[PDB]
Amino acid sequence: SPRSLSARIVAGVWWFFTLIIISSYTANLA
Amino acid sequence: FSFLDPLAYEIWMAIVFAYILVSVVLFLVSPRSLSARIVAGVWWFFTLIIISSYTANLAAFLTVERMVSPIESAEDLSKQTEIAYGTLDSGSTKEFFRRSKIAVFDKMWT
Amino acid sequence: AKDSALSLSNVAGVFYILVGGLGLAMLVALIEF
Protein backbone atom coordinates (compact mmCIF):
# COMPACT_ATOMS: atom_id res chain seq x y z
CA SER A 1 0.00 0.00 0.00
CA PRO A 2 2.01 2.98 -1.33
CA ARG A 3 1.26 6.43 0.10
CA SER A 4 1.77 7.81 -3.42
CA LEU A 5 2.12 11.61 -3.59
CA SER A 6 5.81 12.32 -2.99
CA ALA A 7 6.65 8.81 -1.73
CA ARG A 8 5.77 7.42 -5.16
CA ILE A 9 8.40 9.44 -7.02
CA VAL A 10 10.81 8.73 -4.16
CA ALA A 11 10.41 5.00 -4.80
CA GLY A 12 10.73 5.70 -8.52
CA VAL A 13 14.02 7.54 -8.01
CA TRP A 14 15.44 4.69 -5.90
CA TRP A 15 14.27 2.28 -8.60
CA PHE A 16 16.13 4.20 -11.32
CA PHE A 17 19.19 4.32 -9.05
CA THR A 18 19.33 0.58 -8.34
CA LEU A 19 18.56 -0.13 -12.01
CA ILE A 20 21.55 1.86 -13.22
CA ILE A 21 23.73 0.23 -10.57
CA ILE A 22 22.76 -3.35 -11.45
CA SER A 23 23.10 -2.76 -15.22
CA SER A 24 26.48 -1.07 -14.78
CA TYR A 25 27.65 -3.87 -12.49
CA THR A 26 26.56 -6.43 -15.07
CA ALA A 27 28.42 -4.67 -17.89
CA ASN A 28 31.60 -4.17 -15.88
CA LEU A 29 31.52 -7.77 -14.69
CA ALA A 30 31.13 -9.04 -18.26
CA PHE B 1 28.20 11.54 -19.12
CA SER B 2 29.12 7.85 -19.34
CA PHE B 3 25.66 7.07 -17.93
CA LEU B 4 23.76 8.87 -20.69
CA ASP B 5 26.28 8.01 -23.43
CA PRO B 6 25.77 4.24 -24.02
CA LEU B 7 22.22 4.98 -25.14
CA ALA B 8 21.79 7.62 -27.86
CA TYR B 9 20.45 10.93 -26.53
CA GLU B 10 17.57 10.96 -29.02
CA ILE B 11 16.73 7.56 -27.57
CA TRP B 12 16.51 9.15 -24.11
CA MET B 13 14.18 11.84 -25.46
CA ALA B 14 12.22 9.05 -27.12
CA ILE B 15 11.94 7.03 -23.88
CA VAL B 16 10.73 10.19 -22.14
CA PHE B 17 8.00 10.43 -24.80
CA ALA B 18 7.27 6.74 -24.23
CA TYR B 19 6.88 7.38 -20.52
CA ILE B 20 4.51 10.31 -20.92
CA LEU B 21 2.59 8.31 -23.54
CA VAL B 22 2.13 5.35 -21.21
CA SER B 23 1.19 7.71 -18.37
CA VAL B 24 -1.43 9.55 -20.42
CA VAL B 25 -2.87 6.27 -21.74
CA LEU B 26 -3.10 5.12 -18.11
CA PHE B 27 -4.86 8.42 -17.41
CA LEU B 28 -7.38 7.73 -20.17
CA VAL B 29 -8.20 4.37 -18.58
CA SER B 30 -4.88 -2.64 -7.80
CA PRO B 31 -6.05 -4.10 -11.14
CA ARG B 32 -7.76 -1.77 -13.61
CA SER B 33 -10.09 -3.26 -16.24
CA LEU B 34 -8.27 -4.79 -19.22
CA SER B 35 -6.48 -1.95 -21.03
CA ALA B 36 -4.23 -1.25 -18.03
CA ARG B 37 -2.85 -4.77 -18.51
CA ILE B 38 -1.95 -4.28 -22.18
CA VAL B 39 -0.42 -0.89 -21.33
CA ALA B 40 1.62 -2.23 -18.42
CA GLY B 41 2.51 -5.25 -20.53
CA VAL B 42 3.78 -3.34 -23.54
CA TRP B 43 5.69 -0.98 -21.22
CA TRP B 44 7.17 -4.05 -19.54
CA PHE B 45 8.41 -5.47 -22.84
CA PHE B 46 9.73 -2.03 -23.75
CA THR B 47 11.58 -1.35 -20.49
CA LEU B 48 13.00 -4.88 -20.49
CA ILE B 49 14.43 -4.36 -23.95
CA ILE B 50 15.87 -0.97 -22.92
CA ILE B 51 17.58 -2.22 -19.73
CA SER B 52 18.95 -5.12 -21.76
CA SER B 53 20.27 -2.71 -24.40
CA TYR B 54 21.96 -0.44 -21.85
CA THR B 55 23.49 -3.51 -20.21
CA ALA B 56 24.79 -4.99 -23.47
CA ASN B 57 26.10 -1.73 -24.94
CA LEU B 58 27.87 -0.74 -21.72
CA ALA B 59 29.29 -4.26 -21.59
CA ALA B 60 30.59 -3.95 -25.14
CA PHE B 61 32.29 -0.61 -24.49
CA LEU B 62 33.79 -1.67 -21.16
CA THR B 63 35.03 -4.73 -23.06
CA VAL B 64 36.62 -2.56 -25.76
CA GLU B 65 38.48 -0.52 -23.13
CA ARG B 66 40.00 -3.69 -21.64
CA MET B 67 40.67 -5.28 -25.04
CA VAL B 68 42.69 -2.32 -26.34
CA SER B 69 46.35 -2.45 -25.32
CA PRO B 70 48.74 0.36 -26.31
CA ILE B 71 52.22 -0.21 -27.73
CA GLU B 72 54.09 -2.60 -25.44
CA SER B 73 56.42 -4.96 -27.29
CA ALA B 74 58.90 -3.37 -29.70
CA GLU B 75 58.10 -5.58 -32.70
CA ASP B 76 54.47 -4.53 -32.37
CA LEU B 77 55.60 -0.88 -32.41
CA SER B 78 57.60 -1.39 -35.61
CA LYS B 79 54.72 -2.46 -37.88
CA GLN B 80 52.50 0.54 -37.07
CA THR B 81 52.87 4.00 -38.60
CA GLU B 82 50.48 5.76 -36.20
CA ILE B 83 52.92 6.46 -33.39
CA ALA B 84 56.13 8.02 -34.69
CA TYR B 85 59.35 7.00 -32.96
CA GLY B 86 63.05 7.80 -32.80
CA THR B 87 66.47 7.88 -31.11
CA LEU B 88 69.42 10.14 -30.23
CA ASP B 89 71.14 12.21 -32.94
CA SER B 90 74.52 10.55 -32.40
CA GLY B 91 75.01 7.50 -30.20
CA SER B 92 75.64 3.80 -29.69
CA THR B 93 71.87 3.32 -29.95
CA LYS B 94 71.47 4.90 -33.37
CA GLU B 95 74.63 3.24 -34.64
CA PHE B 96 73.21 -0.01 -33.25
CA PHE B 97 70.01 0.33 -35.28
CA ARG B 98 71.97 1.29 -38.39
CA ARG B 99 74.66 -1.41 -38.27
CA SER B 100 72.16 -4.07 -37.10
CA LYS B 101 70.89 -6.46 -39.77
CA ILE B 102 68.30 -7.99 -37.42
CA ALA B 103 64.85 -7.96 -39.05
CA VAL B 104 62.68 -5.91 -36.68
CA PHE B 105 65.39 -3.38 -35.91
CA ASP B 106 66.25 -3.17 -39.61
CA LYS B 107 62.64 -2.26 -40.39
CA MET B 108 62.62 0.32 -37.59
CA TRP B 109 65.85 1.84 -38.86
CA THR B 110 64.45 1.96 -42.39
CA ALA C 1 43.62 -0.49 -42.91
CA LYS C 2 41.72 -2.53 -45.52
CA ASP C 3 38.50 -4.03 -44.10
CA SER C 4 29.90 4.65 -30.89
CA ALA C 5 26.52 4.73 -29.15
CA LEU C 6 23.28 2.76 -28.98
CA SER C 7 21.45 2.58 -32.29
CA LEU C 8 18.95 5.42 -32.73
CA SER C 9 17.53 3.13 -35.40
CA ASN C 10 17.65 -0.51 -34.25
CA VAL C 11 16.11 0.48 -30.90
CA ALA C 12 13.30 2.44 -32.61
CA GLY C 13 11.48 -0.75 -33.66
CA VAL C 14 10.80 -1.44 -30.00
CA PHE C 15 9.40 2.07 -29.71
CA TYR C 16 7.07 1.20 -32.59
CA ILE C 17 5.77 -2.08 -31.13
CA LEU C 18 5.33 -0.05 -27.95
CA VAL C 19 3.41 2.76 -29.66
CA GLY C 20 1.28 0.15 -31.45
CA GLY C 21 0.48 -1.59 -28.19
CA LEU C 22 -0.43 1.74 -26.62
CA GLY C 23 -2.68 2.56 -29.59
CA LEU C 24 -4.48 -0.75 -29.32
CA ALA C 25 -4.74 0.15 -25.65
CA MET C 26 -6.38 3.42 -26.72
CA LEU C 27 -8.98 1.38 -28.58
CA VAL C 28 -9.62 -1.09 -25.75
CA ALA C 29 -9.70 1.62 -23.07
CA LEU C 30 -11.98 3.93 -25.05
CA ILE C 31 -14.62 1.41 -26.14
CA GLU C 32 -15.40 0.34 -22.55
CA PHE C 33 -15.47 3.77 -20.90
UniProtKB/Swiss-Prot annotation, chain A:
The postsynaptic actions of L-glutamate are mediated by a variety of receptors that are named according to their selective agonists. This receptor binds AMPA (quisqualate) > L-glutamate > kainate. Induction: Down-regulated in the pyramidal cell layer of CA1 in the hippocampus by global ischemia. It comes from Rattus norvegicus. Detected in forebrain. Detected in dendrites of neuronal cells. Expressed in the pyramidal cell layers of CA1 and CA3 and in the granule cell layer of the dentate gyrus. This is Glutamate receptor 2. It is found in: Cell membrane; Postsynaptic cell membrane; Postsynaptic density membrane. Ionotropic glutamate receptor that functions as a ligand-gated cation channel, gated by L-glutamate and glutamatergic agonists such as alpha-amino-3-hydroxy-5-methyl-4-isoxazolepropionic acid (AMPA), quisqualic acid, and kainic acid. L-glutamate acts as an excitatory neurotransmitter at many synapses in the central nervous system and plays an important role in fast excitatory synaptic transmission. Homotetramer or heterotetramer of pore-forming glutamate receptor subunits. Tetramers may be formed by the dimerization of dimers. May interact with MPP4. Forms a ternary complex with GRIP1 and CSPG4. Interacts with ATAD1 in an ATP-dependent manner. ATAD1-catalyzed ATP hydrolysis disrupts binding to ATAD1 and to GRIP1 and leads to AMPAR complex disassembly. Interacts with GRIP2. Interacts with GRIP1. Interacts with NSF via its C-terminus. Interacts with CACNG2, PICK1 and GRIP2. Interacts with GRIA1 and SYNDIG1. Part of a complex containing GRIA2, NSF and NAPA and/or NAPB. The chain crosses the membrane at residues 5-25. Residues 1-4 are cytoplasmic. Belongs to the glutamate-gated ion channel (TC 1.A.10.1) family. GRIA2 subfamily. The M4 transmembrane segment mediates tetramerization and is required for cell surface expression. The gene is Gria2. Palmitoylated. Depalmitoylated upon L-glutamate stimulation. Ubiquitinated by RNF167, leading to its degradation. The chain holds residues 613 to 642 of 883 of the full protein.
